[PDB]
């Protein structure tokens, strides 16, 4: 049915790894979307836009379609995929594959008082792609996702409920805007904080502990 070709893919198929947080912790390179769709079946994928790209040839223009899609489950995990293909349906499917492949976790935090569940981001963050720079700012509870529709949908699929955004540059370049916002939400788990200052024991990698269940 699947027959994976990766140590990590084979382990996920065997059920050795139960959650994607282990993959995110040990920074393993994911090359199979089946890994992501087995680790997160709550994930929702919808295309952000289709645009036609033409390449000149001595006989007319060769037209393909670039699909920008966003994959993400209601809380914590989101990826962004872009693919150019000859047919729209093929571009959409391949973009879904890439967006599942590029899934990253989101550091949700509190704007203050830490009363309920995390709603906003932990820190002000920023991403850049092309000239588009997208800056995410924590917002108080009940503020909503103050963003343009493209980045607002990405944040909704990430799982944040209330956050300010501010973009600089040619924001009309939807692909660059989405890539910048994706970088912005990716940097959240990279920003170091005093609650993250504590030193952790560095566990064995899942592949290292579970190498004994290989073919031979």
């Amino acid at each position: 049915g699947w027959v994976p070709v990766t140590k990590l893919g084979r382990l996920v198929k065997a059920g050795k790894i139960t959650t994607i947080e282990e993959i995110f912790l040990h920074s393993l390179p994911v090359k199979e979307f089946q890994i992501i769709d087995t680790l997160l079946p709550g994930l929702q994928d919808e295309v952000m836009n289709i645009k036609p790209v033409q390449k000149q040839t001595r006989a007319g223009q060769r037209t393909r379609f670039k699909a920008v899609v966003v994959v993400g489950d209601s809380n914590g995990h989101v990826g962004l995929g872009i693919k150019t293909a000859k047919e729209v349906a093929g571009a959409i499917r391949a973009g879904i594959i890439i967006a599942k492949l590029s899934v990253i976790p989101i550091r949700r935090g509190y704007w203050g008082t830490n009363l309920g569940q995390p709603h906003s981001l932990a820190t002000k963050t920023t991403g850049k792609c092309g000239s588009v720079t997208v800056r995410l700012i924590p917002a108080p509870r009940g503020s909503g996702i103050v963003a343009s529709p493209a980045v607002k949908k990405l944040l909704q699929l990430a799982g944040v409920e209330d956050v300010y955004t501010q973009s600089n540059g040619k924001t009309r370049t939807l692909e660059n805007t989405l890539k910048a916002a994706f970088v912005a939400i990716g940097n959240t788990y990279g920003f170091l904080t005093p609650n993250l200052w504590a030193e952790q024991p560095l566990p064995v990698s899942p592949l290292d502990i579970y190498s004994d269940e290989a073919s031979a």
């Binding site: 920074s27 949700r108 569940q117 920003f191 952790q200």
Partner: protein, 87 residues
């Protein structure tokens, strides 16, 4: 980080580089986990017990991974006279 009623949230507390103490990304695919086995008065590796280091892709691409590993090994005792603090 946690909320008011304890209840640790934001699961997957990440790892930090053992040389520069910076967070290792989820997709920082240039970062590695060195495992060094210990010997116990027998000259042989006890399975299931190694000293582990998380080396960040930043220092690996900078080229300071050899110096960093020498320093860590000598600080944890499994190296003797390779790394000198006073350059």
């Amino acid at each position: 980080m946690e909320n008011d009623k304890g209840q640790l949230v934001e699961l997957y507390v990440p790892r930090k580089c053992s040389a520069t103490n910076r967070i290792i990304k989820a997709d920082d695919h240039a970062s590695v986990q060195i495992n060094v086995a210990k010997v116990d008065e027998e000259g042989r590796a006890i399975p299931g017990e190694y000293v582990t280091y998380a080396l960040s892709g930043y220092v690996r691409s900078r080229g300071e991974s050899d110096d960093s590993l020498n320093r860590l090994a000598q600080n944890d005792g499994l190296l003797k006279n390779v790394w000198s603090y006073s350059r």
